[PDB]
Amino acid sequence: DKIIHLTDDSFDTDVLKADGAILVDFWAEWCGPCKMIAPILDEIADEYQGKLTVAKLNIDQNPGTAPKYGIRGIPTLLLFKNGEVAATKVGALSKGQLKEFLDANLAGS
Amino acid sequence: KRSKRKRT
Amino acid sequence: QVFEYAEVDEIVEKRGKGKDVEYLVRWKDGGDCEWVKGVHVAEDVAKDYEDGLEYAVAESVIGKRVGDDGKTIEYLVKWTDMSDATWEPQDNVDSTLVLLYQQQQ
Ligand SMILES: [Ca+2]
């Protein structure tokens, strides 16, 4: 898959022990706004291919990782550089708003 | 688990 | 701001009208009470409150009858939360508990 489906168990190895930039989406099937930005992430993964890694975490199957970062609202986007959080976004947003946020953080490093 | 009930 | 809270336990009170409605919500992770917008509340939780329902824990089922509509089966359920039993639709009652009723025969 060009996207990664994360688990509470693999989150340490896949995200924290990784290199480069990783965008993580906290979502749920019952969540409306979460599915609202779902097609956008697909397009993003294609455009930012090789420069970024897009990943998702289903909070229903994986309720452990979410409270670790104080996430009370979904969808929430966490950007990881090497092993650590660089910037976060809370709520649904247009493709334009996502690219502006994305291009801004990977530019300055 | 939890059951639902009318507002009583 | 478009999002839904992931730690909503139940809706206590309502003080809004139309699409601009506000709910009093208890959290699943902090147990604090504050007002929020209905937009940020999951539809399932919000649906149950608007239907005049509430969440509770059931002791056991003690009675069974045919509803006033004459179509739906109703059960009389003993509640841990309070001392009085109430009649609730079959779908509203815990599935494992109604199986306990058959032993009573
Ligand atoms: Ca919704």
Residue numbers in the entry:
A (entry chain A): 12 to 120
B (entry chain F): 454 to 461
C (entry chain D): 265 to 369
From the paper:
As the interaction of CD3 with A3CT motif IV is rather weak and attempts to crystallize this minimal complex were not successful, we designed a fusion construct with the C terminus of CD2CD3 (residues 264–373) covalently linked (with a triple GS-linker (GS)) to A3CT motif IV (A3CT IV, residues 440–461), to increase the local concentration and to stabilize the interaction. However, as this construct did not result in crystals and motivated by recent success using carrier proteins in crystallization, we fused thioredoxin (Trx) with a single GS-linker to the N terminus of CD2CD3. This Trx–CD2CD3–IV construct could be crystallized and the structure was solved by molecular replacement at 2.8-Å resolution. The Trx–CD2CD3–IV structure contains two molecules in the asymmetric unit and comprises Trx residues 12–119, CD2CD3 residues 265–369 and A3CT residues 453–461. The N terminus of Trx (residues 1–11), the (GS)3-linker between CD2CD3 and A3CT IV and residues 440–452 of A3CT IV are disordered. The two chromodomains are rotated relative to each other by an angle of about 90° and are directly connected without a linker at Gly316. This tandem chromodomain arrangement exhibits a negatively charged and conserved surface in the CD2–CD3 interface that accommodates the highly positively charged motif IV (interface area of about 800 Å2). CD2 is found in an open (unliganded) chromodomain conformation, whereas CD3 adopts a closed conformation as seen for CD2 in complex with RRKRp25 (r.m.s.d. for closed conformations of 1.25 Å for 43 residues). In the CD2CD3–IV complex, A3CT IV adopts an extended conformation and a positively charged KRSKRKR sequence (residues 454–460) at its C terminus is threaded into CD3. While Trp343 forms a π-cation stacking with the guanidinium group of the arginine (in an orthogonal T-shaped geometry) the two other aromatic residues (tyrosines) of the classical cage are replaced by Glu318 and Asp345, which are involved in salt bridges with the caged arginine.
